[PDB]
Design a protein around this ligand. Structure first.
Ligand SMILES: Nc1ncnc2c1ncn2[C@@H]1O[C@H](COP(=O)(O)OP(=O)(O)NP(=O)(O)O)[C@@H](O)[C@H]1O
Ligand SMILES: Nc1ncnc2c1ncn2[C@@H]1O[C@H](COP(=O)(O)OP(=O)(O)NP(=O)(O)O)[C@@H](O)[C@H]1O
Ligand SMILES: [Mg+2]
Ligand SMILES: [Mg+2]
Lengths: 226, 405, 386, 226
């Protein structure tokens, strides 16, 4: 089977009293166990479609079918029941709170997910130990380094073992030395149990490590054009 | 005459970043809820205090100078001694009567007093509450008497009819005489509310001189001083030129509870109607700690410290001064023409609560007092300058450990 | 940790800044509840203390309009105590009310008579000084004087007085000769009210005014405000309802208007602090996007405890702070300045009122939370900042 | 030359009732016309020294002598005189005002400088031409994109012509396709009027365009040791 399908998505904005349409009928598909790369320009379309497949806005233009169910007749309360198993969100602007605990920040999507009390101190530590960050447990995000708290937010959505991770530039603040150290850990998760994810970038030299390259400009995509 | 701290800091107050107008209508109404009802609470207490000095204090004299059960004959010299002292302005004599009335087979107690018609408007506001066309017709010669409305509610008398008022027959020898019957007529009625309307009656002074058969003698001397609170110390030091015995009796007794609730309720408003501004001033502080990040003055940025505080004391005046001038428009429509609105309180509540045992039923009062409308507006805005000064003092030394300039 | 995931996700959301200024502003909602209760159990305590003195002075000086007769007098045989049946009555007693004058040896004074029963209960019984309740024998006609009457008369113990009635006088062919009898004095009662001035105590069985019967039976009402509304009650043949001279009829409305006018004003300091919850939760909807929002009815129920966190501590702290100042207003050293009354302050703290008034300040912290919490679930996640 | 002087600098900080920090024996010296780069690990202390020479730290041990005057022998009300005229602020997490437009955000020293009223729309729009963003001027910062609003904060400090532009990962959101077009722009201001700036990083492949490489190993630095 094929996981994600999308067509006829004419997104239109209303703020500003001016036509700012940037999306149209994008024909994209997401496979299982296959990683792609949304090579979009700096400002073309690669933030609206990033929030549209996760079910965060209703454009009233088409259908976003996902694993057999659509996002049309989903209510405001019944949406969060389906975002626990097959969804995952990774931000790039670091939307985190600087007054929490660093060990409790990765253990936050485990209390409301009906988990065991002894399972909180087990699954939240095995992800930070494999990445090599274990000496910054009882600290605040106001005190963490520039590349320390950036690697925390990558492993935040990887605590419930999802099937689709929505990310954009994981190597934002971290350099190329910390890039391939964490790109391998994203590769073992696809080979042990199978985790399909997409990485939204702009550079062309970074996307050659993956196996599926699709370039996009203003929602238009036909082939590998440059 | 635009200065340097008010001209280049006007564009920073206007902001628009999404969900702003839904929270901008909270601080300007929260600062207006304590001022729009502040002109109502200051008018309701002063409106009831105005009725205390009009129908209670203005109708009862204060200074009492009498003799040893004897008509004071030389009262012309008593008016010359205490007239121009520092504290007593004017004075007028009066003679009390202890007679009863008998009209229409109705019995009621009455304490008739003798007021001079030409010495009643200079020291008291008693004949200034007439509901007729004029009150200058009250004079002597035709035996007129003005009574209250409380007598007509029990004796069913009418204004213009003749009644029968009995007077005690006086005698310089102590014996028993026949009771006198004097037929008088009502030439106007005075209105009070419920307290002194059934015990007072006014006859002229020349009619009082003919009843007791005296030539130039009165019994008591009434006066009124400046202050209304000091009544137990000003009368005691005003009888050193008269004889050694005067009826010294201050106005204290059974009507004590009507004075305690006008002086201590005003005293507790300094901790209640000032505290409502003290809770409402927390609204302008919560937006300053909200705007302590991403602001010119809390960021890295030869001027003095007034350049940083110029954006903090002007944001409080954008919602505080606009809220005070808005609450006075909706505050005058509830203190003059009010309507009952408390009717839908126990209809759609789901589960019944508030088991009543004994309470009171609200109604509509009647008052008119409009003088504290500008003095209450200036004192509600000066403390907002100090309410933003204390966050401005702590907004100069912040380590940028979490925020990056 | 905690076994429930409801009280743990808001402990670090009430100020975790290491400074001397930003830490105290997180507990600014605690001050608005602690000072809101402080201005709540203070004014209502001194208002009920002033109303308590009104009940002690009322129903202890004179009765009101009870019975009347349009055909003359009333006979006790045709109208016993079991025939009349009214609401609010608990005990009946005979009474004779009539204004009479006094012919003393110094001056003349007018007062009303009180035909009490020596074998029954009297309201002036604790105010009896050097007198017994059973001293009004039929044939002696003992008169008990007061304080204000003897100040201008000088009637000592063992003085004969002469009481005359101006109304009960037979139409003689030569003038009008009133009725008068011989009297005496036995003592002086003290009550420190209006009854000591122009109110005398006489026997119920007397022939100085009429005839032998009584005027009626007095009663005591539980509330003197509803006398004008209960004047439309049934009346048997031989009675008439009289005007009760409403001194406290509409004046009681003016002294209870401050409970309804300032009470709506005093209900706003707990409403001004209700907008303090919205300005302390309106910035929480943009920071919750990232922990419990992007990653069902109990998800929005995390702010109902933090929105009521100032309602639990601030109520139990303001109750001890409000009772410390309302019970001792002039007891402590006055730092404000001049004391206006400074003497004999009555207090009234009801135990049945402090339980109900503690629920008003508690329920406002839960009902003012649902409207900011409604904008956290129905609103789209990725629209506030990004 | 010389402009910067410092000697025996030491930082003290408390972490859980123990006086522990990460900074020891720093030694930096900049000139006029030359640029340098500082490579530090995630937890080495590069941002602590970055807030130290900019007048935002009171370590009460050493002294930072800039422009012939120290940073500690003055009142606290006059410490902000060397922060916009001869100092820049470039960081990876730019803190922009979300309640204003993009033209007011880049003209931050122009409004507080008590300049001419006809000068506000004179140099703010000129710096946006160099970065190539003219159609995103009168918009909200939420309307600005992820990879382009990072470049907006680059032209925010380069308005009042500072002397020392302090950078902290300028290539955090934009990719390498737009990094080489903006790295030629920083080298143009040195040939126009003469300026010096230090650009810290962690990767050495994009730092090959720097004329001086001085990496940092937990505060201490002697030579090219990797
Ligand atoms: N409130 C708004 N009113 C009008 N248009 C808006 C509004 N918010 C966003 N937009 C538009 O929607 C776009 C959202 O970014 P988009 O081009 O769809 O993805 P992207 O910018 O390429 N990804 P990224 O560069 O990482 O931010 C903005 O560039 C605007 O053109
Ligand atoms: N005001 C302060 N002064 C000194 N040290 C501080 C201060 N605030 C926090 N610290 C500590 O000093 C360190 C700050 O460095 P950190 O946030 O880890 O980034 P960094 O590694 O020093 N440089 P970078 O990787 O660019 O963020 C932490 O160990 C903090 O606990
Ligand atoms: Mg950094
Ligand atoms: Mg992006």
């Amino acid at each position: 089977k094929i996981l994600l399908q999308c067509d006829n998505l004419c997104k239109r904005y209303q703020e500003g009293s001016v036509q700012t349409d940037v999306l149209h009928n994008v024909s994209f598909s997401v496979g299982e166990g296959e990683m792609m790369a949304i090579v979009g320009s700096s400002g073309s379309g690669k933030s609206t479609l990033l929030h549209l497949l996760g079910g965060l806005d209703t454009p009233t233009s088409g259908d976003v079918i996902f694993n057999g169910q659509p996002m049309s007749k989903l209510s405001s309360a019944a949406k969060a029941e389906l975002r626990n198993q097959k969804l995952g969100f990774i931000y790039q602007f670091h939307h985190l709170l600087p007054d929490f605990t660093a060990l409790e920040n990765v253990a936050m999507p485990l209390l409301i997910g009906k988990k065991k009390p002894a399972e909180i101190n087990s699954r939240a530590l095995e992800m930070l130990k494999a990445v090599g960050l274990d000496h910054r447990a009882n600290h605040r995000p106001s005190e963490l380094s520039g590349g320390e708290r950036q690697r925390v937010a990558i492993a935040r959505a990887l605590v419930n073992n999802p099937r689709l991770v929505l990310a954009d530039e994981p190597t934002g603040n971290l350099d190329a030395r910390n890039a391939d150290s964490i790109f391998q850990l994203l590769g073992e998760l696809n080979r042990l149990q199978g985790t399909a994810f997409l990485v939204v970038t702009h550079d062309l030299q970074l996307a050659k490590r993956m196996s599926r390259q699709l370039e996009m400009r203003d929602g238009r995509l036909t082939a590998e054009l440059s | 005459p635009l200065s340097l701290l008010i001209g280049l800091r006007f564009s920073r107050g206007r902001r628009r970043g999404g969900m702003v107008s839904l929270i901008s209508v909270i601080s300007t109404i929260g600062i207006a809820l304590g001022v729009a009802v502040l002109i109502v609470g200051l008018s309701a207490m002063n409106g009831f205090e105005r009725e205390l000095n009009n129908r209670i204090l203005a109708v009862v004299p204060h200074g009492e100078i009498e003799a040893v059960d004897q008509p004071w004959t030389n009262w012309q010299e008593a008016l010359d001694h205490v007239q121009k002292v520092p504290g007593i302005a004017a004075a007028a004599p009066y003679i009390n009567f202890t007679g009863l009335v008998e009209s229409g087979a109705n019995l009621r107690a009455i304490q008739v007093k003798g007021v001079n018609p030409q010495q009643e408007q200079r020291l008291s506001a008693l004949p200034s509450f007439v509901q007729g066309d004029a009150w200058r017709n009250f004079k002597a010669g035709e035996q007129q008497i003005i009574i209250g409305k409380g007598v007509a509610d029990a004796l069913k008398v009418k204004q213009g009819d003749w009644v029968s008022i009995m007077i005690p027959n006086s005698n310089p020898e102590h014996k028993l005489m026949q009771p006198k019957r004097v037929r008088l007529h009502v030439a106007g009625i005075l209105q009070l509310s419920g307290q002194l309307d059934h015990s007072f009656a006014m006859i002229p002074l020349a009619d009082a001189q003919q009843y007791l058969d005296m030539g130039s003698s009165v019994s008591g001397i009434a006066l009124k001083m400046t202050d209304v609170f000091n009544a137990n110390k000003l009368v005691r030091d005003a009888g050193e030129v008269t004889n050694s015995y005067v009826y010294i009796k201050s106005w204290i007794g059974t009507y004590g509870y009507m004075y305690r609730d006008i002086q201590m309720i005003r005293a507790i408003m300094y901790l209640a109607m000032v505290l409502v501004i003290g809770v409402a001033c927390f609204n302008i502080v919560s937006t300053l700690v909200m705007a302590v990040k991403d602001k010119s003055g809390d960021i890295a940025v030869g001027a003095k410290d007034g350049l940083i505080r110029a954006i903090f004391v002007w944001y409080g005046l954008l919602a505080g001064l606009f809220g005070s001038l808005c609450g006075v428009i909706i505050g005058v429509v509830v203190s003059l023409q009010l309507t009952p609105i408390i009717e839908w309180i126990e209809k759609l509540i789901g589960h019944q609560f508030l088991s009543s045992d004994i309470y009171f039923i609200d109604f509509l009062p009647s008052e008119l007092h409009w003088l504290d409308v500008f003095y209450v507006l200036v004192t509600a805005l000066l403390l907002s300058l100090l309410a933003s000064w204390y966050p401005a003092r702590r907004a100069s030394n912040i380590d940028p450990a979490r925020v990056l300039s | 940790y905690q076994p429930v995931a409801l009280f743990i996700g808001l402990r670090y959301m009430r100020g975790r800044a290491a400074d001397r200024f930003g830490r105290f502003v997180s507990w600014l909602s605690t001050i608005g509840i602690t000072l809101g209760v402080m201005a709540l159990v203070t004014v209502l305590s001194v208002m009920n203390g002033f109303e308590r003195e009104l009940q002690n002075n009322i129903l202890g000086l004179m009765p009101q309009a009870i019975l009347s007769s349009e055909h003359g007098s009333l006979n006790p045989q045709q109208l016993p105590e079991t025939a009349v049946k009214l609401d609010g009555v608990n005990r009946v007693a005979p009474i004779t009310t009539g204004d009479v004058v006094l012919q003393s040896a110094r001056s003349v004074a007018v007062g009303v008579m009180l035909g009490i029963d020596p074998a029954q209960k009297d309201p002036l019984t604790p105010y009896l000084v050097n007198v017994k309740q059973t001293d009004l024998e039929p044939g002696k006609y003992n008169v008990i004087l007061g304080e204000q009457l003897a100040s201008q008369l000088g009637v000592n113990r063992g003085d004969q007085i002469r009481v005359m009635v101006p109304s009960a006088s037979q139409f003689t062919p030569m003038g009008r000769i009133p009725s008068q009898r011989l009297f005496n004095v036995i003592g002086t009662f003290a009550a420190n009210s209006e009854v000591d001035g122009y109110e005398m105590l006489v026997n119920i069985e007397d022939a100085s005014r009429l005839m032998g019967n009584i005027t009626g039976w007095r009663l005591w009402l539980d509330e003197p405000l509803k006398v004008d509304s209960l004047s439309q009650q049934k009346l048997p043949e031989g009675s008439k309802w009289q005007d009760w001279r409403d001194r406290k009829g509409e004046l009681f409305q003016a002294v209870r208007m401050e409970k309804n006018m300032m009470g709506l004003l005093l209900s706003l300091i707990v409403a001004v602090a209700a907008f303090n919850i919205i300005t302390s939760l309106g910035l929480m909807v943009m920071e919750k996007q990232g922990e419990v929002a992007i990653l069902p009815r109990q998800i929005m129920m995390v702010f109902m405890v933090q929105g009521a966190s100032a309602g639990i501590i601030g109520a139990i702290l303001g109750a001890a702070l409000g009772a410390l100042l309302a019970s001792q207003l002039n007891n402590l050293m006055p730092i404000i300045g001049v004391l206006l009354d400074g003497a004999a302050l009555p207090v009234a703290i009801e135990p049945l009122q402090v339980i109900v008034i503690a629920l008003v300040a508690m329920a406002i912290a839960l009902l003012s939370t649902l409207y900011p919490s409604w904008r956290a679930a129905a609103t789209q996640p990725a629209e506030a900042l990004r």
